[PDB]
Each structure stands twice: as C-alpha cells, then as structure tokens.
Amino acid sequence: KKKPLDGEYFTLQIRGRERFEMFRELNEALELKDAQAGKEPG
Amino acid sequence: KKKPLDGEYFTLQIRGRERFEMFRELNEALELKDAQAGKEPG
Amino acid sequence: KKKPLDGEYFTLQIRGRERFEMFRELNEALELKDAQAGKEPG
Amino acid sequence: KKKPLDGEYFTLQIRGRERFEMFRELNEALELKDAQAGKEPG
Numbered sequence: 543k544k545k546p547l548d549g550e551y552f553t554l555q556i557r558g559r560e561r562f563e564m565f566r567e568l569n570e571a572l573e574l575k576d577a578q579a580g581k582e583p584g
Numbered sequence: 585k586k587k588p589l590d591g592e593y594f595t596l597q598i599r600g601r602e603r604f605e606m607f608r609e610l611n612e613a614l615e616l617k618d619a620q621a622g623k624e625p626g
Numbered sequence: 627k628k629k630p631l632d633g634e635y636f637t638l639q640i641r642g643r644e645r646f647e648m649f650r651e652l653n654e655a656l657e658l659k660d661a662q663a664g665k666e667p668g
Numbered sequence: 669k670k671k672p673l674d675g676e677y678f679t680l681q682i683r684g685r686e687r688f689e690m691f692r693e694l695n696e697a698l699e700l701k702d703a704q705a706g707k708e709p710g
Contacts, residue, residue: 552604554596556611562594564690565607569598571655574662606648613697616704636688638680640695646678649691653682 556562598604640646682688 549600549603552598552601554598554604554608554611556594556596557615558591559594561591561614562596565611566596568610568652568655569596569607571652571659572603573599574658575655578658610694610697613694613701616700617697620700633684633687636682636685638682638688638692638695640678640680641699642675643678645675645698646680649695650680652694653680653691656687657683 554565556565596607598607638649640649680691682691
C-alpha cells in the first residue's frame with residue numbers, strides 16, 4: 543500500500559466542536575494539494 | 585481551576601513535522617484571542 | 627469562460643513576507659478542494 | 669506612532685464572503701500573539 547512511512551505523524555487537541563471541523567478542513571486541503579503535487583508532470 | 589468543562593475537546597492527526605508545528609500555531613493563536621475575548625470590557 | 631460571477635471576491639492585508647506566502651497557500655488549498663467538490667460524482 | 673515600517677505589507681484575494689471572514693480571523697489571531705510576543709519579559 544505504498545507504506546504509511548511518509549513524514550512522521552502527529553496530533554493536536556482543538557477545543558470547540560465547530561472550530562475542530564474547521565482545522566480538520568485545512569488539513570485535508572493541504573493533503574489534497576500534495577496529491578496533485580506528487581503527480582508526475584507531462 | 586474554573587473546570588475544563590468548556591467546549592468538547594477533540595484531536596486531529598497532522599502528517600509532517602514542520603507542518604504540524606504550523607497547525608498548532610494557529611490553534612494557540614485563536615486561544616489567545618479567546619483570552620482577551622472573555623476579558624470584561626470597561 | 628464560465629464567468630467569474632461566483633461568490634463575491636474580497637481581499638486581506640497580511641504583514642510579513644514569509645507569513646503572506648503561508649496565507650496564500652491555505653487559500654489555494656481550499657480552492658483545490660472546491661475544484662474536486664464541483665466534480666460530478668459517478 | 670512607532671512607524672508602520674515593520675515587515676513588508678502584502679494582500680491576498682479570497683473568493684467567498686463567509687470564507688473571507690475566516691481568513692481575516694486567522695490573520696488577527698497571529699497579530700494578537702505578536703503583541704504579547706514583543707511584550708518585554710519579567
């Protein structure tokens with residue numbers, strides 16, 4: 543499965559329910575760019 | 585100690601070491617504003 | 627060109643050069659998700 | 669007034685009204701920490 547041995551994984555506590563969803567959203571956003579970032583050019 | 589019974593607490597996994605510190609920074613930023621937000625006016 | 631009449635556009639001043647690039651990065655991240663968000667399912 | 673000659677100022681266009689307010693919020697958050705960051709210790 544390509545192994546999850548990418549960068550070290552971490553965690554962060556976020557108080558607030560609505561605010562939490564907001565942080566997670568930014569995280570998935572960067573992960574999405576990384577998907578097209580490692581996309582071979584051409 | 586005013587009890588930690590504020591909003592429900594949550595957590596988020598952030599891959600990458602440098603990126604992790606970045607997310608945590610934004611979290612502490614909002615928490616700082618909340619400190620002066622609950623500061624009685626006058 | 628599909629017209630740029632989407633949501634109203636706005637602007638934000640960000641002091642600091644390194645910090646500025648950081649904000650712009652988050653903006654492009656959300657815009658990327660929106661691209662796959664409006665992607666017809668199936 | 670201490671002169672606004674701090675780091676170079678910049679700008680960023682953010683589509684969406686609700687989203688715009690969100691970005692501006694993060695900006696003010698970092699600026700708040702900077703205020704207590706330049707606060708002489710002791």
